[PDB]
Amino acid sequence: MELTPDQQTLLHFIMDSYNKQRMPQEITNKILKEAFSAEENFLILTEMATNHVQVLVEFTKKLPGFQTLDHEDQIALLKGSAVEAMFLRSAEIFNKKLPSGHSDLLEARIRNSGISDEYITPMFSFYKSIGELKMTQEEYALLTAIVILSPDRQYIKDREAVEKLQEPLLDVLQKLCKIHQPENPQHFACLLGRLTELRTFNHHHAEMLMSWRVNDHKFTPLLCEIWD
Amino acid sequence: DHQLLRYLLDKD
Numbered sequence A: 001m002e003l004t005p006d007q008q009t010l011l012h013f014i015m016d017s018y019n020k021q022r023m024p025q026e027i028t029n030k031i032l033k034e035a036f037s038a039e040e041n042f043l044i045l046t047e048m049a050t051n052h053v054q055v056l057v058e059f060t061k062k063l064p065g066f067q068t069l070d071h072e073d074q075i076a077l078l079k080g081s082a083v084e085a086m087f088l089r090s091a092e093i094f095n096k097k098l099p100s101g102h103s104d105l106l107e108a109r110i111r112n113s114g115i116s117d118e119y120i121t122p123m124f125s126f127y128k129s130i131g132e133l134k135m136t137q138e139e140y141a142l143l144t145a146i147v148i149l150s151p152d153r154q155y156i157k158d159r160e161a162v163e164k165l166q167e168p169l170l171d172v173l174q175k176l177c178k179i180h181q182p183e184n185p186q187h188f189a190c191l192l193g194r195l196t197e198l199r200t201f202n203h204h205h206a207e208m209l210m211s212w213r214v215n216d217h218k219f220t221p222l223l224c225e226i227w228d
Numbered sequence B: 001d002h003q004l005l006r007y008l009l010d011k012d
Ligand SMILES: O=C(O)c1ccc(CN2C(=O)C3(CCN(S(=O)(=O)c4ccccc4Cl)CC3)c3cc(Br)ccc32)cc1
Pocket: A021, A022, A023, A024, A027, A045, A046, A048, A049, A050, A051, A052, A055, A086, A089, A090, A091, A093, A094, A106, A107, A110, A205, A208
């Protein structure tokens, strides 16, 4: 029927942190103005990818309990969720935030950046599949928090501490499905489908970086350090 | 190692 005052408080903190994301004006202006070349298109995308890492960290820091975790486990969670959080935020932006005209130029830039179809095809396939679910802002925010507070990421020393933060988010998300979609009992199951679909992007992304060499304009030293 | 993530996490 309704969220408990404690669940409402937890949801508000995640919503507030999630709603802080705002695509910078200089990035939006570049999508419109810059030359339509593989080199210029790839540079725009690298800047967007780098900007997402800063957005992710700032969002994560405000997640209830994140700051209470061991410092090395905070790093491990950020590193283990970076790719997954990026594709999820990208799916939200592509289906909601960006206007039809600029989304079209951004899609044109992505499709003409030098990146292989082996990575572009599952990317847009996932955006369409996310779009079908007509996710609310509470659902995107909670799914993002769930993705980041994953207890099974590599190099986590205290997994029980992370499970204690992830379990109440899964409880709130399932409750929100029961309140807002009481006619569709499979709504929560569809959202879980996106968690497993997002996991497939870790491999796709790792291979994409491997395809990049020093001789090519695609070599991104900073991003390659954050992604391993 | 993890110098950028560390800096961003341990700032403001
Ligand atoms: O507020 C900000 O500053 C900000 C900026 C950015 C994002 C998210 N976002 C992305 O990161 C990309 C996806 C990955 N690609 S990419 O070119 O495919 C690539 C590049 C390098 C390494 C791997 C990958 Cl997959 C770059 C752009 C993207 C495409 C859309 Br549409 C919407 C969103 C996003 C969120 C917030």
